[PDB]
Amino acid sequence: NPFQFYLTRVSGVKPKYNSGALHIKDILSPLFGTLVSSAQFNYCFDVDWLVKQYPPEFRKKPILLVHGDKREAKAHLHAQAKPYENISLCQAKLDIAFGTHHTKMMLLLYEEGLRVVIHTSNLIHADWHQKTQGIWLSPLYPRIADGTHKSGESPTHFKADLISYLMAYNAPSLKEWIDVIHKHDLSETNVYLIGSTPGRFQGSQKDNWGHFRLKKLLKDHASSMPNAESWPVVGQFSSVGSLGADESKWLCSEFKESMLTLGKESSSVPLYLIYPSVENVRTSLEGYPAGGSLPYSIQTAEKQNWLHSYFHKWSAETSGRSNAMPHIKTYMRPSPDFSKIAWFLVTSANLSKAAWGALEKNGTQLMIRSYELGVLFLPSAFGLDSFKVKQKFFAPMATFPVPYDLPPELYGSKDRPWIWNIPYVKAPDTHGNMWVP
Ligand SMILES: O=C(O)c1ccc(C(=O)O)c(C(=O)O)c1
Numbered sequence: 001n002p003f004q005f006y007l008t009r010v011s012g013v014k015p016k017y018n019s020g021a022l023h024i025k026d027i028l029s030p031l032f033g034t035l036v037s038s039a040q041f042n043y044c045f046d047v048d049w050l051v052k053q054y055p056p057e058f059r060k061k062p063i064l065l066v067h068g069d070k071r072e073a074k075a076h077l078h079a080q081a082k083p084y085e086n087i088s089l090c091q092a093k094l095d096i097a098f099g100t101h102h103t104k105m106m107l108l109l110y111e112e113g114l115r116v117v118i119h120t121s122n123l124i125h126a127d128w129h130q131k132t133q134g135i136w137l138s139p140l141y142p143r144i145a146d147g148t149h150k151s152g153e154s155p156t157h158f159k160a161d162l163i164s165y166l167m168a169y170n171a172p173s174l175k176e177w178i179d180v181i182h183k184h185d186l187s188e189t190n191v192y193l194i195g196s197t198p199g200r201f202q203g204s205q206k207d208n209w210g211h212f213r214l215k216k217l218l219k220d221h222a223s224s225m226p227n228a229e230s231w232p233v234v235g236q237f238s239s240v241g242s243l244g245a246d247e248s249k250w251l252c253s254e255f256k257e258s259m260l261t262l263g264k265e266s267s268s269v270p271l272y273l274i275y276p277s278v279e280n281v282r283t284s285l286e287g288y289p290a291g292g293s294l295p296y297s298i299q300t301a302e303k304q305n306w307l308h309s310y311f312h313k314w315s316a317e318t319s320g321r322s323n324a325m326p327h328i329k330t331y332m333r334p335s336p337d338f339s340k341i342a343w344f345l346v347t348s349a350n351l352s353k354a355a356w357g358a359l360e361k362n363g364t365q366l367m368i369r370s371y372e373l374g375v376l377f378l379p380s381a382f383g384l385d386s387f388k389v390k391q392k393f394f395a396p397m398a399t400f401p402v403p404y405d406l407p408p409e410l411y412g413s414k415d416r417p418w419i420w421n422i423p424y425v426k427a428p429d430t431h432g433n434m435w436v437p
Pocket of ligand 1: 043044100102122238239293294295348350
């Protein structure tokens with residue numbers, strides 16, 4: 001696994017499909033480092049559960065929970081953490097309406113160094129039980145000797161970019177973690193950071209975040225190939241926001257335009273969107289309750305039925321996870337026969353303007369509502385022109401482990417996208433139940 005891209009363990013699949021997977025207890029194990037302190041960035045927390053995932057000998061080390069909760073939600077989280085004297089909270093500012101703190105990241109400070117984990121799972125039991133989730137594990141970063149002056153920077157600029165992401169919170173508890181990062185050597189990092197932070201960005205700052213950040217990296221660090229117009233774009237997500245009355249409002253005009261960038265010079269590129277059908281959810285390991293974590297509302301969906309003609313079923317025989325509903329989000333650029341990919345992104349970002357940004361003020365300002373974070377795998381960062389797609393996820397080794405099946409399979413005429421707040425009472429799920437919200 002030279003890309004250090006992992007799936008979470010899934011209860012109920014055969015051992016061959018969990019052999020190279022990671023549970024949260026594995027990540028926090030003493031085998032990964034001797035914990036001194038940690039920060040848990042996330043959206044939803046079960047604090048009693050979370051502390052039990054740390055090894056007993058590490059359960060009293062300081063923990064910082066970075067969240068976006070307000071009002072009664074914030075009070076509930078404080079009450080959850082109150083019994084644990086070692087747990088501090090950091091409330092991420094959300095000064096733009098309808099924004100969220102979605103970023104999922106662990107900062108793990110050890111006696112031996114520092115590790116960064118960027119992943120897709122909430123800190124609750126159900127997100128690690130029977131879902132398809134993604135994890136990127138950084139190398140163990142050694143500390144820079146006191147008195148030594150070196151950058152500790154990687155060719156992908158990951159150290160400066162992670163510090164920049166953290167500086168946008170303007171938070172004292174995160175300045176402490178910025179100072180920790182400054183003291184470590186991150187030069188071995190071979191991924192690019194793609195973050196979103198709330199704000200309105202113009203000028204140079206426009207390229208710092210969201211889909212303009214992706215565009216800039218693809219312009220600077222990928223190459224266009226002949227017949228590039230035939231290389232599809234694939235997006236794969238667990239929720240969809242309001243994208244507008246037709247595809248030209250945002251999806252195909254600025255989102256797809258950023259995703260199809262390759263190289264510096266200057267559309268019929270196919271766009272495949274992967275999102276679970278009702279049948280995918282009904283026959284899943286969890287049954288209909290998996291749809292609680294696929295929060296596409298009827299109010300949103302009924303305004304954009306044009307979108308569903310882009311939708312393809314969830315299928316993941318390659319990793320034994322066709323019945324483990326996706327909470328991972330991924331985006332990638334495969335070749336016309338899906339045998340190679342020009343790049344791969346794993347991220348918290350769903351298919352929404354809130355997460356990726358939407359242009360404002362006559363195309364001069366990028367407005368983002370939410371916090372998001374992911375990592376981009378580019379062939380150039382590995383001395384390659386493209387990645388070969390791995391045929392079996394858990395089976396050279398410059399081959400990238402794409403976790404679901406290619407080519408994606410279009411919905412059938414009877415399929416419908418999972419919509420969480422309407423009832424399904426025609427056919428029961430794998431546990432014998434209907435869905436009545
Ligand atoms: O659309 C929503 O309301 C929503 C809220 C929270 C999350 C999350 O897990 O952090 C997600 C998701 O990632 O699917 C979606």
